[PDB]
Structure formats: structure tokens, C-alpha cells
Amino acid sequence: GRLIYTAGGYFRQSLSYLEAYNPSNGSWLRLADLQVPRSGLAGCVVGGLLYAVGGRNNSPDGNTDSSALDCYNPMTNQWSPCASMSVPRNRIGVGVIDGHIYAVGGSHGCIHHSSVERYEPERDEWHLVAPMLTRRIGVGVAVLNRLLYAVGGFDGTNRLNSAECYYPERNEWRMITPMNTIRSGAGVCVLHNCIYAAGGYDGQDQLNSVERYDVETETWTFVAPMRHHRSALGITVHQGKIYVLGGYDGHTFLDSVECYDPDSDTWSEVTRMTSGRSGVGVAVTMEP
Ligand SMILES: O=C(O)CN(c1cccc(-n2ncc(C(=O)O)c2C2CC2)c1)S(=O)(=O)c1ccccc1
Numbered sequence: 001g002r003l004i005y006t007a008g009g010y011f012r013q014s015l016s017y018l019e020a021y022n023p024s025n026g027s028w029l030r031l032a033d034l035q036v037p038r039s040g041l042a043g044c045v046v047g048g049l050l051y052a053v054g055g056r057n058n059s060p061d062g063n064t065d066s067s068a069l070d071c072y073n074p075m076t077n078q079w080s081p082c083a084s085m086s087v088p089r090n091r092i093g094v095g096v097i098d099g100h101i102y103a104v105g106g107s108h109g110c111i112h113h114s115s116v117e118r119y120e121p122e123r124d125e126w127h128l129v130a131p132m133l134t135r136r137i138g139v140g141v142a143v144l145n146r147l148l149y150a151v152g153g154f155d156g157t158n159r160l161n162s163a164e165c166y167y168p169e170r171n172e173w174r175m176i177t178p179m180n181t182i183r184s185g186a187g188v189c190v191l192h193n194c195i196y197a198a199g200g201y202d203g204q205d206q207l208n209s210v211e212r213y214d215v216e217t218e219t220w221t222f223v224a225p226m227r228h229h230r231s232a233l234g235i236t237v238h239q240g241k242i243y244v245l246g247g248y249d250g251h252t253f254l255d256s257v258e259c260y261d262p263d264s265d266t267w268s269e270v271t272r273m274t275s276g277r278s279g280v281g282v283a284v285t286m287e288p
Helices: none
Strands: 004-008 018-022 027-031 040-048 049-053 056-059 063-064 069-073 078-079 094-096 099-103 117-119 125-129 140-144 146-153 163-167 172-176 189-190 194-198 211-215 221-222 234-238 241-247 256-261 266-273 281-285
Touching: 004 040, 004 049, 004 234, 004 241, 040 094, 040 099, 049 099, 049 281, 099 146, 140 194, 146 194, 172 221, 189 234, 189 241, 194 241, 234 281
Parallel strands: 040 281, 094 140, 140 189
Antiparallel strands: 004 018, 004 281, 018 027, 040 049, 049 069, 056 063, 069 078, 094 099, 099 117, 117 125, 140 146, 146 163, 163 172, 189 194, 194 211, 211 221, 234 241, 241 256, 256 266
């Protein structure tokens, strides 16, 4: 569609913001708040509807991991609850295949999930599928050619450079080539025939480097780095360019939004969020 939606996130506490950015004119709209604050969620779109999945509500009076699935309709500017997942999943990743939402990994307290489940909007039902070979929280998830990829994360002991791919007709996960960088809390997306991994935390520093996996060659190659180091960033694709939103650079919760042009291999700053934040969910759909 036409707008980049950012939902939730964190600054001092988990946030309820829903704000939509219009690349064609630089404007930001503040829309209906989430019913429950959440950071560490993921966003996706199915059938023009925006979905917010998992996360946690970190507040002064609690830390509650979320199993929730909530649906925002831009025509109504209203959120509606959907069926909840089998388990809470903070620091989640999600991907959409053939109209179904895959929820991957994430945490529930000290439980680091390898489990994966699939939502069918037409039935308002979740079902578990085969689990990953690795437990992954802060996991980047992307879909390319109707295969599901889980990239990096944290397994409960180590941050990971490993990645793996889910083959739905076989209900099976297989490792792919590992990245050249350990990345947890990175932004992962697909552009053309490559899976991009931008930023994240490597155990020592937040990262500005960006690398992409070419599914034809099975190799990871670095591209131009972002202007800002960032972990727990939001990421999406809009008209053939990658947009990264917010995150944490080790000093500040960023309001910076950067845009990658793959033809020129350059990043530029395109706008600022209305306030700095990390751990947002991001997706693109029609204006409301
Ligand atoms: O949930 C939480 O603990 C916090 N948030 C969050 C959200 C998504 C992913 C990750 N994440 N997962 C594994 C690692 C890992 O350090 O290896 C991480 C972090 C990002 C590198 C965490 S946050 O509120 O947005 C937030 C982010 C940064 C600073 C303060 C708060």
C-alpha cells in the first residue's frame, strides 16, 4: 500500500503508539493507540489489515510477555483482538506466507523459544508447526519465494550468526549459510532476491553494518553500512527501498529513519519519528 506503520516500541517503558509515515510527502499521522502497550513485538500485513504480534508490556508496575495478536483496520482506525498464540513471545519475529502469519521464537521469561506457530485469519486459529533447530529470541524473520527464514538472535547463552530456513511443504527447518556477523535484535527484510540483515547487537556493540544473503549463491555479502548503529530497529521495504526506523545506539533511543537505495548502495536520512524509541513493529499498508 502507501504508508509505513510503526506500532508500539520502548522509551522508558513500553509504548502504545501507532503512527504512520507517508514517504510521498514526509508526513506522520498519529493513529489509534494499541489497547496494551508493547515493545519487542513484530508487525505484518495480511489482506490490507495490520497485525501486531507478541512483545511485552514493560511498565513501572510489571513486565508481562505477550501472546497477543491484534488487528488494526485502517478504514476504521480501530484495533480488534484476535486469537492469542500458544505462548507469550517477546522479542519475536514474524513472516507472512500465502495469507498466513508465522510467529517465530521469542521469549517468555527465561524461556527462549525454538517453537513456531502459524495463524490462519479465515479461521482465527493458531497452530504449532515444526520448531526451529535453534532457540532464537531477538530473531529476524523474512519471507522470500514462499520460504521462511530465521536469522540470528540469542539462544539463551550466545548471540548468533547462524540462520535457518523453513520449507512449509516439508514442515522442516534447515540451516543456511551463517552470516559474517553475530547479530541479535537486527532488522531483517527481503529485497529483490536477497535477505538483508541490518544492525543488531553482536555481544559487544550495536551495529551499523548491513549484509545480504543471495538465495541463488547461498553467500552473505556486506553492503553500505547505515549512518547510525542500531539494535532493536524496525525495518520494512517500500517501493524497492529499505527503511529502518529507530532503535538503540548504545547512548540514545533513536528517532532516525534511514532509507537504503540498492541501485546506488547508499543510505540517507529521510525523516525522524515523532520521538525516539526501540523495539517497534513495522509494516506497510493503505492509508486510513
Ligand atoms: O525485550 C527487551 O529485553 C528489550 N527490547 C528488545 C526488543 C527487540 C529485541 C531485543 N533483543 N533481543 C535479544 C537482544 C540481545 O541483546 O542479544 C536484544 C537487544 C536489542 C539488542 C530487545 S526494547 O524494549 O525495545 C530495548 C532495546 C534496547 C535498549 C533498551 C530497550
